Symmetry: C4
Subunit: 91 residues, 4 copies
């Protein structure tokens, strides 16, 4: 497998783990909700809640700038790998 | 004409069918609401609601990562291969 | 002025007018709220409401695919024009 | 080093200051909440709230169109000029 894809995967996972830890401890979310919030924030889908604490709001601002580029780089490389078998079967 | 476009089109349709079936079954949404939720999620517009079940939350996370790349790949091919040539042709004085 | 920018502007305005007309009449929104909903939908910011009618939900799905590419093309060209005087003053 | 980056950085800071001042004044938000609202709007994440005043709604529409291009231009330059070289340097065996 492509090292470039593997590194993007690792960076993404590490970034989502850090968010899950932060929001589950600081904002009192269940782990699955902390992970969900991290994911929909960094992919810009968003959701129906926001952090309650000032610490949480500051973290989220920085989290977005730290992570959005990484996540969308991963989504793009993932898309190439997911769609390529179908392209190659059709070509 | 463009086989990458054809693939991205079919994959996008299949993805939206899968979301419509999932969210109507697991989250109890009307089929039209399940399709709406799938579309606004994968285009990253977002929705006034969120999944209520843990199954729905886990599925949505995976659906987001796989689906955004496909849907926006389709949107780009649509813009380049259909909308842009249509706009250009519609600006020609005749 | 660049014709490419002028056409993107016109297309964007026409698309937002169509959304404002639709959501103000079909979904019963005030004009400013119908315009706001159209804008945050096509730029993918989103907001705290969704269409109530099935007609509205179908329109919004199609609206997104019809308009998202146009709007982001305009946002990009706008950004070039807005930032260029500052770049040229700094270079 | 990269003067386009410097411009996009300063313009992004000025934009977020303007939003923080606007939403705290016109919409009554705490400064920290006004900054948060400005950031999630211009990165297109979105927020659980929306402007309540018609002034806030009109401003936000204009803020979105001007601000998204600047903020995401900054994000791209940040990725290419800072984060990517930092990642590459941090992967070198030493
Ligand atoms: Cl959990
Ligand atoms: Cl239905
Ligand atoms: Cl009005
Ligand atoms: Cl404050
Ligand atoms: K949203
Ligand atoms: K978005
Ligand atoms: K959003
Ligand atoms: K929302």
């Amino acid at each position: 497998k492509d090292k470039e894809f593997q590194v993007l995967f690792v960076l993404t996972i590490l970034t989502l783990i850090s968010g899950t830890i932060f929001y589950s401890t600081v904002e009192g979310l269940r782990p699955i909700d902390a992970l969900y919030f991290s994911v929909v924030t960094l992919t810009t889908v968003g959701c129906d809640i926001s952090p309650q604490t000032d610490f949480g709001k500051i973290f989220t601002i920085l989290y977005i700038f730290i992570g959005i580029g990484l996540v969308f780089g991963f989504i793009h490389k993932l898309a190439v790998n997911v769609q390529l078998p179908s392209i190659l079967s059709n070509l």
